[PDB]
Design an enzyme around this catalytic site. Structure first.
Site, mmCIF file in Angstrom:
data_model
loop_
_atom_site.group_PDB
_atom_site.id
_atom_site.type_symbol
_atom_site.label_atom_id
_atom_site.label_comp_id
_atom_site.label_asym_id
_atom_site.label_seq_id
_atom_site.Cartn_x
_atom_site.Cartn_y
_atom_site.Cartn_z
ATOM 1 N N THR A 187 7.408 26.355 7.324
ATOM 2 C CA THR A 187 5.760 25.772 6.557
ATOM 3 C C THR A 187 4.851 26.655 7.120
ATOM 4 N N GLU A 196 12.464 12.198 1.295
ATOM 5 C CA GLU A 196 11.235 11.940 0.588
ATOM 6 C C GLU A 196 9.548 12.196 1.205
ATOM 7 N N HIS A 236 13.275 11.149 4.840
ATOM 8 C CA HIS A 236 13.120 12.414 5.659
ATOM 9 C C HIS A 236 12.437 13.393 3.907
ATOM 10 N N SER A 290 -0.576 27.440 -3.718
ATOM 11 C CA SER A 290 0.099 28.563 -4.072
ATOM 12 C C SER A 290 -0.582 28.971 -5.368
ATOM 13 N N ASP A 306 9.481 23.017 -24.507
ATOM 14 C CA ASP A 306 9.580 20.934 -24.324
ATOM 15 C C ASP A 306 10.173 20.748 -22.870
ATOM 16 N N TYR A 331 9.361 15.603 2.285
ATOM 17 C CA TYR A 331 9.166 16.330 1.786
ATOM 18 C C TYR A 331 9.167 16.864 0.091
ATOM 19 N N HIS A 387 14.302 11.693 13.394
ATOM 20 C CA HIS A 387 13.791 11.622 14.503
ATOM 21 C C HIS A 387 12.925 10.612 14.163
ATOM 22 N N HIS A 388 13.027 9.459 12.746
ATOM 23 C CA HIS A 388 12.206 8.230 12.795
ATOM 24 C C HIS A 388 13.316 7.463 13.622
ATOM 25 N N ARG A 439 1.101 -0.178 15.765
ATOM 26 C CA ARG A 439 0.690 -0.078 13.856
ATOM 27 C C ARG A 439 1.991 -1.206 13.612
ATOM 28 N N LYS A 469 4.168 29.505 4.313
ATOM 29 C CA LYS A 469 3.359 29.782 4.052
ATOM 30 C C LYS A 469 1.867 28.817 4.222
ATOM 31 N N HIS A 522 0.455 -1.107 -0.509
ATOM 32 C CA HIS A 522 0.050 -0.136 0.055
ATOM 33 C C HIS A 522 1.254 1.021 0.466
ATOM 34 N N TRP A 532 7.206 -1.524 4.436
ATOM 35 C CA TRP A 532 7.760 -0.008 3.195
ATOM 36 C C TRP A 532 9.341 0.338 3.672
ATOM 37 N N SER A 589 14.544 6.593 -12.617
ATOM 38 C CA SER A 589 12.770 7.129 -13.276
ATOM 39 C C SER A 589 13.689 8.178 -13.008
ATOM 40 N N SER A 590 13.083 8.732 -11.329
ATOM 41 C CA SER A 590 13.189 9.969 -10.937
ATOM 42 C C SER A 590 14.466 10.290 -10.998
HETATM 43 C C1 HEA Z 1 4.003 14.877 3.167
HETATM 44 C C2 HEA Z 1 4.770 13.626 3.476
HETATM 45 C C3 HEA Z 1 5.281 14.903 5.348
HETATM 46 C C4 HEA Z 1 5.336 16.481 5.917
HETATM 47 C C5 HEA Z 1 5.255 17.257 4.886
HETATM 48 C C6 HEA Z 1 5.801 15.239 7.266
HETATM 49 C C7 HEA Z 1 6.097 17.174 7.488
HETATM 50 C C8 HEA Z 1 6.409 17.252 9.251
HETATM 51 N N1 HEA Z 1 6.973 15.388 10.162
HETATM 52 FE FE1 HEA Z 1 6.094 13.982 9.395
HETATM 53 N N2 HEA Z 1 6.208 12.331 8.535
HETATM 54 C C9 HEA Z 1 5.623 11.278 8.017
HETATM 55 C C10 HEA Z 1 5.268 12.437 6.248
HETATM 56 C C11 HEA Z 1 5.377 13.928 6.756
HETATM 57 N N3 HEA Z 1 5.814 14.121 7.696
HETATM 58 C C12 HEA Z 1 5.458 10.234 6.932
HETATM 59 C C13 HEA Z 1 5.076 9.122 6.490
HETATM 60 C C14 HEA Z 1 5.721 9.620 8.383
HETATM 61 C C15 HEA Z 1 6.365 8.180 8.219
HETATM 62 C C16 HEA Z 1 6.808 7.249 8.210
HETATM 63 C C17 HEA Z 1 6.869 5.707 8.847
HETATM 64 O O1 HEA Z 1 7.713 5.601 9.682
HETATM 65 O O2 HEA Z 1 7.088 5.353 8.104
HETATM 66 C C18 HEA Z 1 6.431 10.265 9.068
HETATM 67 C C19 HEA Z 1 7.171 10.305 10.689
HETATM 68 C C20 HEA Z 1 7.895 11.508 10.922
HETATM 69 C C21 HEA Z 1 8.076 12.023 12.264
HETATM 70 C C22 HEA Z 1 8.633 9.918 12.810
HETATM 71 C C23 HEA Z 1 7.476 9.524 14.475
HETATM 72 C C24 HEA Z 1 7.895 8.366 15.014
HETATM 73 O O3 HEA Z 1 8.241 7.644 14.293
HETATM 74 O O4 HEA Z 1 7.713 7.679 16.322
HETATM 75 C C25 HEA Z 1 7.995 12.870 12.844
HETATM 76 C C26 HEA Z 1 9.237 12.814 13.925
HETATM 77 O O5 HEA Z 1 9.734 13.408 14.385
HETATM 78 C C27 HEA Z 1 7.505 13.908 12.209
HETATM 79 C C28 HEA Z 1 7.476 14.875 11.923
HETATM 80 C C29 HEA Z 1 7.058 16.229 11.802
HETATM 81 C C30 HEA Z 1 7.522 17.332 11.285
HETATM 82 C C31 HEA Z 1 7.522 17.787 12.700
HETATM 83 C C32 HEA Z 1 6.656 17.793 10.480
HETATM 84 C C33 HEA Z 1 6.554 19.778 9.656
HETATM 85 O O6 HEA Z 1 7.710 19.414 8.062
HETATM 86 C C34 HEA Z 1 5.479 20.042 9.948
HETATM 87 C C35 HEA Z 1 5.554 21.410 9.685
HETATM 88 C C36 HEA Z 1 3.923 22.062 9.669
HETATM 89 C C37 HEA Z 1 3.317 22.848 10.501
HETATM 90 C C38 HEA Z 1 3.729 22.605 12.192
HETATM 91 C C39 HEA Z 1 2.004 23.371 10.798
HETATM 92 C C40 HEA Z 1 1.720 24.059 9.372
HETATM 93 C C41 HEA Z 1 3.047 25.766 10.027
HETATM 94 C C42 HEA Z 1 2.438 26.700 11.188
HETATM 95 C C43 HEA Z 1 0.190 26.916 11.300
HETATM 96 C C44 HEA Z 1 2.869 27.776 11.956
HETATM 97 C C45 HEA Z 1 3.029 27.482 13.900
HETATM 98 C C46 HEA Z 1 3.367 26.384 13.861
HETATM 99 C C47 HEA Z 1 3.437 26.385 15.063
HETATM 100 C C48 HEA Z 1 4.554 27.375 16.095
HETATM 101 C C49 HEA Z 1 4.095 24.728 15.393
HETATM 102 N N4 HEA Z 1 7.193 13.469 11.075
HETATM 103 CU CU CU Z 2 11.457 12.960 8.714
#
Ligand code: HEA
Ligand code: CU
Ligand code: TGL
Ligand code: PEK
Ligand code: PGV
Ligand code: DMU
Ligand code: CUA
Ligand code: MG
Ligand code: NA
Ligand code: ZN
EC number: 7.1.1.9
Lengths: 105, 98, 46, 514, 227, 43, 144, 79, 259, 73, 84, 49, 58
Positions: D316, D242, D240, D255, D91, D244, D290-291, D438, D319, D61, D126, D156-157
């Protein structure tokens, strides 16, 4: 930028240009309604007289509509503006959107 | 030490590469490699926009360092004005490869 | 040259909406069905 | 002609179309797998009677949704269609290499389906951590087929990243600086730079896993002096960046959509938006551990990764607030694409905030490997990415096809999807806080209520997906051709009509320097 | 253990876990406020016919929405790191216990004095005694002295596992060839449950952990009887 | 956006047909597999 | 008046409250009376009739502000249809419960739950707030 | 003589979460000491502290594998 | 007729044949590792080679023979080659990470020391030093080749490029001999794993870069290059310097510091 | 008839924004106060009251007599 | 550093050829001498069946499964020791 | 001129809501789903040992 | 050797509508057909092998 008075005078001068053309009339109104304000009666007065010199009755009515629209929920602004323009409306024979039924949906 | 036997671009460049090289030699830019320089852009001194057809897209950067570009079709005929800044543009159509 | 225009810049035909419905059904339906049949396959192996 | 056009393409629009079709089909596969997950969990006990199969379904999945749905749609699909048009380019820089990035994906996908058909599948997660993914606990071909699937998807990527960077740097009008290019183009450039640097590290790590499994190396095997944790560092050094990579082209589309349906000529604070995406991309490389907060990490390292992770909230938030400030003063058009973008802004923010909770390694000890993490990333990633994709799709479908959607049907689709995803994922926060792990096929009885609601939610999103296929059919069935489009003066991709000619910008745009 | 319809964390069994509860309350208040503020501003942006569409200057407001988020992060980071370093501080345990993960059960070794070790398996659902908990009970619990600082060492004899007890705030991965340390202290007697927390194959869901916390003198006699 | 009227209008009845076929194409094959799971689980 | 696909590169008409004076007139080809009306417009507008003023407006513009800004009943169709499809989803869930799911474990039987609940209270599960905290151990009943 | 052992104390050479090297170092120290004592005609009793520490910390299966490899002649540490 | 300077490429089958060759090579390695058969892998290697030959043949046709490489097109290829080399740097970085992780914290199974108990490293002052001098020398001769080309000197460009290729071959034969003579193997724990996989991928890149120089040699013999336009030679030289720099990091890290 | 007084005509959007951002700040203050009393202080006080006169041996004896332990009957 | 040489009036083809034949290839010639002088086989060490070496978790995909790819019978023992 | 929403919107809204509530209530209460709600205030504890 | 690039330039610029990968003449077509036959036949063979490998052979 500038004081309110300077801003209004600049826009009065813009629409008062004797040979303002149709493109410049539109550009002016379409730019002016981008701002956070309902234009002062003196600005609208100059734009309606530009309409007269451009033989464009339709755009004069539309300008009155957009004054009403720019006021949003502040329902007291448009009747005030119409009140202030009434000598100009009478002199130029401009009917309001309401007098023409164009305020009905 | 030192000999020859390597061709030059003058001898051996061909196709579009050669066209660009020979045009650059004459100070011409038929393949749009350079940015054109603006005129004053008044109705009397409009920006002259070459085209091989009867209309061409213009992007107008109205003020230096604007990040927003204003895009519009410029058609053969009377000069048109940027819808943001009013600067004038006039299409000058046609030709290229003689 | 190649066909241009709505309905022509795509690798499938939209000339007939019912044939299109059948093609889209098979297309999206085959993707959706595949995991169910892979699970069935793995269960049937033991 | 058909083969020349669709198998031998060198055209950025047709290749973009191929990626959209591919990604849509992959999205069906991924959705079906997600419904099998939630059917297994929908009531206490066992459904499949085979937890190895449950683990294979979970693993597939994620790979399908990430590598075959999101990345192909956003970067291959919207990227190829829109980036050359937005910069007036004829192009991509490497139009024939572009076609190989596309055609590597069906074989990559076939390898992943092969992995699940042979032996007992790759029931690894995964993340594919050894030793579970090694040749004793997963003997046989499945994990190697998964590794090769990732290799082909990576090539590819990487090649697509080279192509997009080169195109965006080299193929703008000579007067257009990088600070005159649209934000979607910036978001694709920055995503490509992340792909370029991060995928080779993943390729190194999974190649070491391949040699541990088949050539008797021991990078990850303690008996030879290896270390399973080394794999985790190499995986997450990619992983990580990935996440972003998955969201950044979504930020770009958001935007554009918010600007467009607010009736604005430009997003609020353009250079702040550029700064914020570059800052996110940069910080995205220095936070990966942090993972790994529960692997036995020294306290000063946990303090650093906690603090560096939280800093990402600052760019973030710029934005998020800048999108709100773009709405501010707008003549709002409540189009279906606008609804998707507003849903994005709110639901991405929820997910980002739960990410900030997880960044605190002391709380992550209790929340790691629970459904709180699953809830975090299905908000920010699953909903964030999917809502940006749907909003982009509805917004640009008339550009790509020349036909309009029925907007009422599209609003109905949005409403159903919005209810479904929130019913599915919001209760998973409770499950995680109260300690449900999980990657489980069944749970202690106390967790039944929220699991039951979450699984019912997943069926609502299914109904939305089926409806979306019908809505696309109806548009192609009815053939309402586009006549006029607003705001072309600040949306160059629309100015060549709908659909644009096969070749666009054969004569380039004229842009003065002054 | 968790109870039906639970929304938040299990009640704290250790002082570290009570710390985490207060820190989570603080962080969740901030999360709720920000998410609600964003939703409110969205509704505010969308509910007026008034317009302003000319170019807007951004630098004043970007100071506010970088400085205020930076301050909020510091207000989270400060208590967050205080807890982190408090957990790490020197404790001197009175007892060391090892646990080894296996596919799919845990073993325990208490070898400070005698050689005591045993395996600990999930009770199958069909074998549960009336009122026992499905997927959570084991045949041999981890008996431990209450109100004492205990060093747990965690490893594995095959793939990765992870040894977790949520009400004590514990989760430590079990990695073959590595000996991970954590400390545990229960304020109360009782039974405290956890579950394997790193995917380890087809019975990942079915190798739970049960601690049984009792007075030292019961723990001593239980230990002697398990030789 | 503005558009022309549909070149091949899809009536409410035609829409009901298209929607019904779309939904059955997703529901029937999965339904068949799931209905028969026990026939697989001990085959 | 017909707008064609091949006119995409030309300025077009739009009704937008924030673009009140569009780039072209709504009506480009005038009847003979409309042409004469346009000539009369060059004289005093006081001599125009109301109907003539209205016609001049409708030559320049398609919809008035009141018309273009009007609310619709579409929300009823959207919300109702969404509820219909959410209702349809429950039919899928009824089918799944009937045909796919077998019995749940015996631990959910009423007598098991009653015993399990006593045992949770005997081990004082969540005694500070969550569970046993809500039991009155002195009065042998759930706290009111 | 200086006993009352309860468990292995904190050791500043090994302050972090991974204790593998603490187990290893005390196993080595014990057998190095036992070797020196058994050789130079002394008493292994002086080695007891290292014995107690490594028994407390080391997984039984690690100790048993290392013992087997010492008997086999394939133990890779220096004793 | 276009009036930009960029290259619209003819519809081409090589992307598809290259993608399918990737499927056959990976499927084939799976079949070799698990089903005792080399058949699919040999087909995939053959189609991969055919694909590369025809694709790059066509790029030469497009540029030398058809004139499609304007300065703008050439500038894009420069960026593309630089970005490709960056991706290869990051690939090797994963292997250096693996090497330092294992050697800076040697585990008890190794004897808690690096090099592990029972490992007898090569002497870095013997063939590894010779290999170092060989690749450094080839960086000097390829720079001589580049300057001869810019100065229009056909014979000395050919001589310098031949010398460069001969050195690359010498490096490859030396490393092949070292592999055979080595008393440790890829199965000798993480010492053998990091040594052979990291130097093995490096050796593969030496063979690739040597092949690229050989293509340039034959294009030079056929007068393809002008004194000002010769991007395939520049790309091959950049790649060759990349291969040299990776070797220096391997030498210092694995052979010297790790001995 | 009566003339209408001149109204505020400028900055209406900005005025509305400032009014409601201030309002949102005030509400946020209110919520923080509600929350720290209904959740955060409530929690501190529950734990403090629980442990203030808590007798861990008595608790154990009750659990033991109810039969819950393997190690104590 | 500046090495200890000089030129820099122009770093063209003649200078790089000078470096190629004057420095680079002499260096290779010297290292070739150094190497093929410290050659000659050294006495192979006693076999010890250490468990971190001669790893076999899966048979190799060639030969009898138990020989590495560039197996040298002189210096590479099998898991059971040196070959006959 | 009335569009689709003027003619059918009230019916679509009323029928859709009625149908949605009816079928979810039936699904939640009549087909044997075990929600496992809290025992608190609902379950009389019973001797287990 | 002699510089024959001009002859090749004439060949590959001939206005015959051929795409660049076939413009060298009949041997291009043969090499293309060999390449595509091996690719497609190998792909079919890999599908057969998946079918074989998808089931146990005890
Ligand atoms: C689109 C994909 C995506 C994105 C953008 C993010 C963004 C972030 N992620 Fe994560 N994350 C995942 C996809 C993503 N993540 C996935 C797939 C996993 C699991 C992997 C797996 O184990 O399978 C994961 C796991 C993951 C973990 C590991 C948890 C664990 O396994 O124990 C952590 C730990 O710090 C984390 C933190 C964050 C943080 C801090 C952001 C930050 O970038 C977020 C920032 C955004 C904001 C905070 C909101 C907007 C901001 C405001 C409104 C401003 C004011 C806010 C404050 C003052 C707080 N993410
Ligand atoms: Cu991460
Ligand atoms: C957030 C996205 C939209 C969500 C929509 C679906 C969800 C429904 C509305 C959703 C209503 C949103 C409010 C949150 C739920 C409140 C329950 C709670 O008190 O939970 C508290 C804690 C733990 O608390 C405790 O330790 C004390 C428990 C006290 C028990 C009292 C009895 C409660 C009875 C049962 C309640 C059932 C809950 C509902 C069950 C829900 C079923 C789906 O749990 C948690 O941490 C869970 C929170 C996870 C962190 C993510 C928060 C992101 C912000 C959400 C949007 C807010 C702005 C929009 C404001 C709302 C606008 C929509
Ligand atoms: C002078 C340098 C020569 C280098 C090339 C030698 C031939 C190998 C051909 C391909 C090389 C490609 C990459 C190298 C990867 C594997 C490392 C092998 C380096 C090498 O050749 O190592 C040899 C063992 O090789 C073995 O297993 C032989 C293994 C052969 C099969 C390799 C299997 C292919 C696995 C490759 C997957 C690659 C994935 C790449 C992804 C790229 C990004 C998508 C060492 O021999 P030994 O007998 O153990 O010790 C010597 C004792 N006297
Ligand atoms: C046993 C032997 C086989 C082993 C397997 C590997 C095979 C080896 C492949 C070796 C690479 C050969 C590349 C040849 C490219 C020839 C085409 C070329 O060089 O094309 C040049 C363009 O450069 C361009 O495309 C630049 C194109 C750059 C290509 C770079 C290729 C690197 C490939 C690496 C692939 C493996 C990756 C690593 C695996 C882990 C053409 O422009 P110019 O030169 O300016 O000419 C024009 C003038 O004549 C006008 O006056
Ligand atoms: C998550 C994805 C799934 C979502 C929910 C799926 C909704 C189900 C749609 C209906 O599926 C059909 O159901 C029938 C039963 O209602 C099955 O007939 C089965 O049952 C009939 C009646 O018992 C017999 O006549 C048939 O032969 C027998 O195959 C039939 O095969 C199956 O296609
Ligand atoms: Cu053991 Cu999961
Ligand atoms: Mg984990
Ligand atoms: Na289940
Ligand atoms: Zn302008």
């Amino acid at each position: 930028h500038e004081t309110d008075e300077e801003f209004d005078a600049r826009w009065v001068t813009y629409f008062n240009k004797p040979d303002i053309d149709a493109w410049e009339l539109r550009k002016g109104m379409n730019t002016l309604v981008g701002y956070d304000l309902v234009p002062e009666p003196k600005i609208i007065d100059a734009a309606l007289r530009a309409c007269r010199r451009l033989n464009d009755f339709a755009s004069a009515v539309r300008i009155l509509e957009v004054v009403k629209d720019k006021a949003g929920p502040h329902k007291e602004i448009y009747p005030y503006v119409i009140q202030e323009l009434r000598p100009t409306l009478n002199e130029l024979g401009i009917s309001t959107p309401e007098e023409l039924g164009l305020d009905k949906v | 030490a030192s000999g020859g036997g390597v061709p030059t671009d003058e001898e051996q460049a061909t196709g579009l590469e050669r066209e660009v090289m020979l045009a650059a030699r004459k100070g011409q830019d038929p393949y749009n490699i350079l940015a054109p320089k603006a005129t004053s852009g008044t109705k009397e001194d409009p920006n002259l926009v070459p085209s091989i057809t009867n209309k061409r897209i213009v992007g107008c950067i109205c003020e230096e360092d604007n990040s927003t570009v204003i895009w519009f079709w410029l058609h053969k005929g009377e000069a048109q004005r940027c819808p943001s800044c009013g600067t004038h543009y006039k299409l000058v159509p046609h030709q290229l490869a003689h | 040259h190649y066909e241009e225009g709505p309905g022509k810049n795509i690798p499938f035909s939209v000339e007939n909406k019912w044939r299109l419905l059948a093609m889209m059904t098979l297309f999206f339906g085959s993707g959706f069905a595949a995991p169910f049949f892979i699970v069935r396959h793995q269960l049937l192996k033991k | 002609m058909f083969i020349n056009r669709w198998l031998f393409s060198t055209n950025h629009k047709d290749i973009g179309t191929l990626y959209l079709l591919f990604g849509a089909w992959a999205g069906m596969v991924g959705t079906a797998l997600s419904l099998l997950i939630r059917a297994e969990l929908g009531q206490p006990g066992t459904l499949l009677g085979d937890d190895q199969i449950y683990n294979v379904v979970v693993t597939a999945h994620a790979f399908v949704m990430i590598f075959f749905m999101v990345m192909p749609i956003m970067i291959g699909g919207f990227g190829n269609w829109l980036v050359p048009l937005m910069i007036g380019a004829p192009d991509m820089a490497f139009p024939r290499m572009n076609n190989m990035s596309f055609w590597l994906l069906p074989p990559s996908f076939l390898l992943l389906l092969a992995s699940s058909m042979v032996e007992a599948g790759a029931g690894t997660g995964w993340t594919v951590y050894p030793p579970l993914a090694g040749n004793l606990a997963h003997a046989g071909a499945s994990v190697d087929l998964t590794i090769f699937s990732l290799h082909l998807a990576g090539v590819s990527s990487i090649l697509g990243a080279i192509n997009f960077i080169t195109t965006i740097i080299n193929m703008k009008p000579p007067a257009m600086s990088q600070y005159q290019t649209p934000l979607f183009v910036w978001s694709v450039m920055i995503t490509a730079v992340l792909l370029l640097l991060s995928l080779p590290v993943l390729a190194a790590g999974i190649t070491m896993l391949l040699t541990d499994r088949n050539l008797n190396t021991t990078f990850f095997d303690p008996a030879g002096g290896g270390d399973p944790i080394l794999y985790q560092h190499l995986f997450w050094f990619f992983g990580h960046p990935e996440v972003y990579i998955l969201i950044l082209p979504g930020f770009g589309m958001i935007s554009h959509i918010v600007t467009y349906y607010s009736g604005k000529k430009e997003p609020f604070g353009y250079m702040g938006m550029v700064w914020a995406m570059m800052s996110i991309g940069f910080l995205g490389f220095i936070v990966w551990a942090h993972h790994m907060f529960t692997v036995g990490m020294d306290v000063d390292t946990r303090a650093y990764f906690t603090s560096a992770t939280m800093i990402i909230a600052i760019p973030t938030g710029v934005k998020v607030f800048s999108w709100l400030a773009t709405l501010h003063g707008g003549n709002i058009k409540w189009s279906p694409a606008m609804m998707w973008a507003l849903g994005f802004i709110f639901l991405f923010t929820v997910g980002g905030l739960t990410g900030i909770v997880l960044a605190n390694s002391s709380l992550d000890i209790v929340l790691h490997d629970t459904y709180y993490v699953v809830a975090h990333f299905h908000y920010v990633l699953s909903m964030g990415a999917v809502f940006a994709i749907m909003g982009g799709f509805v917004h640009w479908f008339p550009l790509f096809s020349g036909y309009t959607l029925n907007d009422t049907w599209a609003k109905i689709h949005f409403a159903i999807m919005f209810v479904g995803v929130n019913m599915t994922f919001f209760p998973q926060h409770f499950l995680g806080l109260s300690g449900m792990p999980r990657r489980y096929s069944d749970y202690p009885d106390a967790y039944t209520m929220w699991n039951t609601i979450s699984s019912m939610g997943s069926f609502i999103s299914l109904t939305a997906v089926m409806l979306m296929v019908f809505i696309i059919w109806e548009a192609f069935a009815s053939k309402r051709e586009v006549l006029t489009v607003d705001l072309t003066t600040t949306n160059l991709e629309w100015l060549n009509g709908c659909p644009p000619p096969y070749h666009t910008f054969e004569e380039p745009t004229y842009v003065n320097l002054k | 253990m968790a109870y039906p319809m639970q929304l938040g964390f299990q009640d704290a069994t250790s002082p570290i876990m009570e710390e985490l509860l207060h820190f989570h309350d603080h962080t969740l208040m901030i999360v709720f406020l920000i998410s609600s503020l964003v939703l409110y501003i969205i509704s505010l942006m969308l509910t007026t016919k008034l317009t302003h569409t000319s170019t807007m200057d951004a630098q004043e407001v970007e100071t506010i929405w970088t400085i205020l988020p930076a301050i909020i992060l510091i207000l989270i980071a400060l208590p967050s790191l205080r807890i982190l370093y408090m957990m790490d501080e020197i404790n001197n345990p009175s007892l060391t216990v090892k646990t080894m993960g296996h596919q799919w059960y845990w073993s325990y070794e208490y070898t400070d004095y005698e050689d005591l070790s045993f395996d600990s398996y999930m009770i199958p659902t069909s074998e549960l005694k009336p009122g026992e908990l499905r997927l959570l009970e084991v045949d041999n619990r981890v008996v431990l002295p209450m109100e004492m600082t205990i060093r747990m060492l965690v490893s594995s004899e095959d793939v990765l596992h992870s040894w977790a007890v949520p009400s004590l705030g514990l989760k430590t991965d079990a990695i073959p060839g590595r000996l991970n340390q954590t400390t545990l202290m229960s304020s109360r007697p009782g039974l405290y449950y956890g579950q394997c927390s790193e995917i380890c194959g087809s019975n990942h869901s079915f190798m739970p952990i049960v601690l049984e916390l009792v007075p030292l003198k019961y723990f001593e006699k239980w230990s002697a009887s398990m030789l | 956006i503005t558009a022309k009227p549909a070149k091949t209008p899809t009536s409410p009845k035609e829409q009901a047909i298209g929607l019904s076929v779309t939904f059955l194409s997703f529901l029937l094959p999965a339904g068949w597999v799931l209905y028969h799971l026990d026939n697989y689980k001990k085959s | 008046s017909v707008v064609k696909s091949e006119d995409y590169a030309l300025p077009s008409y739009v009704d937008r409250r924030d673009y009140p004076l569009p780039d072209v007139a709504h009506v480009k080809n005038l009847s003979a009376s409309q042409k004469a009306l346009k000539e009369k417009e060059k004289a005093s507008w006081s001599s125009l009739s109301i109907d003539e003023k209205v016609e001049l407006y409708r030559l320049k513009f398609k919809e008035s502000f009141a018309e273009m800004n009007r609310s619709t009943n579409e929300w009823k169709t959207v919300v109702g249809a969404a509820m219909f499809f959410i209702g349809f989803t429950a039919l899928l869930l009824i089918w799944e419960k009937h045909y796919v799911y077998g019995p749940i474990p015996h631990t959910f039987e009423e007598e098991w739950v009653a015993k399990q609940t006593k045992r949770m209270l005997d081990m004082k599960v969540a005694p500070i707030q969550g569970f046993s905290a809500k039991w009155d151990y002195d009065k042998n009943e759930w706290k009111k | 003589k200086i006993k009352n052992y309860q468990t292995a104390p904190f050791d500043s050479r090994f302050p972090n979460q991974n204790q593998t090297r603490n187990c290893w170092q005390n196993y080595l120290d014990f057998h190095r000491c036992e070797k020196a004592m058994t050789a130079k005609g002394g008493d292994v009793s002086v080695c007891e502290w290292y014995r107690r520490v490594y028994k407390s910390l080391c997984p039984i299966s690690w100790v048993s594998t290392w013992d087997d490899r010492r008997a086999e002649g394939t133990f890779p540490g220096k004793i | 007729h276009q009036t930009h300077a960029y290259h619209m490429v003819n519809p081409s089958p090589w992307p598809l044949t290259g993608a399918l060759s990737a499927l056959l090579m990976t499927s084939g390695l799976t079949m070799w590792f698990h089903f005792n058969s080399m058949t699919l892998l040999m087909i995939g290697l053959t189609t991969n080679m055919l694909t590369m030959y025809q694709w790059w043949r066509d790029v030469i046709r497009e540029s030398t023979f058809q004139g499609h490489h304007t300065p703008a097109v050439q500038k894009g290829l420069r960026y593309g080659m630089i970005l490709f080399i960056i991706s290869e740097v990051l690939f090797f970085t994963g292997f250096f990470w693996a090497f330092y992780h294992s050697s800076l914290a040697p585990t008890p199974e190794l004897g808690g020391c690096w090099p592990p108990t029972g490992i007898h490293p090569l002497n870095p002052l013997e063939v590894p030093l010779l290999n170092t001098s060989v690749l450094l020398a080839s960086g000097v001769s390829i720079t001589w080749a580049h300057h001869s080309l810019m100065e229009g000197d056909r014979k000395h460009m050919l001589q310098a490029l031949f010398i460069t290729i001969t050195l690359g071959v010498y490096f490859t034969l030396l490393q092949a001999s070292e592999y055979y003579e080595a008393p440790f193997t890829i199965s000798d724990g993480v010492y053998g794993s990091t040594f052979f996989v990291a130097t093995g991928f490096h050796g593969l890149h030496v063979i690739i870069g040597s092949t690229f120089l050989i293509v340039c040699f034959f294009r030079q013999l056929k007068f393809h290059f002008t004194s000002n336009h010769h991007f395939g030679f520049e790309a091959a030289a950049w790649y060759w310097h990349f291969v040299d720099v990776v070797w220096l990091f391997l030498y210092v890290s694995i052979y010297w510091w790790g001995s | 008839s009566t003339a209408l007084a001149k109204p505020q005509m400028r900055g209406l959007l900005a005025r509305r924004l400032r009014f409601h951002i201030v309002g949102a700040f005030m509400v946020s203050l209110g919520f923080a106060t509600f929350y720290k009393f209904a959740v955060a202080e409530k929690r501190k006080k529950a734990y403090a009251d629980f442990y203030r006169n808590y007798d861990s041996m008595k608790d154990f004896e009750e659990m033991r007599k109810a039969g819950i332990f393997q190690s104590a009957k | 550093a500046s090495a200890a040489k000089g030129d820099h009036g122009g770093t063209g083809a003649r200078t790089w050829r000078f470096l190629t034949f004057g420095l680079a290839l002499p260096s290779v010639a010297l290292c070739t001498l150094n190497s093929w002088l410290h050659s000659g086989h050294r006495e192979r060490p006693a076999f010890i069946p250490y468990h971190h070496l001669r790893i076999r978790t899966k048979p190799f995909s060639w030969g009898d499964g138990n020989h590495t790819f560039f197996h040298n019978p002189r210096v590479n023992p099998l898991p059971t020791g040196y070959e006959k | 001129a009335p569009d689709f929403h003027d003619k059918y919107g009230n019916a679509v809204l009323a029928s859709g809501a009625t149908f949605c509530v009816a079928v979810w209530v039936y699904m939640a209460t009549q087909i044997g789903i075990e929600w496992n709600p809290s025992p608190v205030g609902r379950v009389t504890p019973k001797e287990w040992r | 050797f002699e510089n024959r690039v001009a002859e090749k330039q004439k060949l590959f610029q001939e206005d015959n509508g051929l795409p660049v990968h076939l413009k060298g003449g009949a041997t291009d077509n043969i090499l293309y057909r060999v390449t595509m036959t091996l690719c497609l036949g190998g792909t079919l063979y890999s599908l057969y092998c998946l079918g074989w490998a998808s089931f146990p052979h005890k």
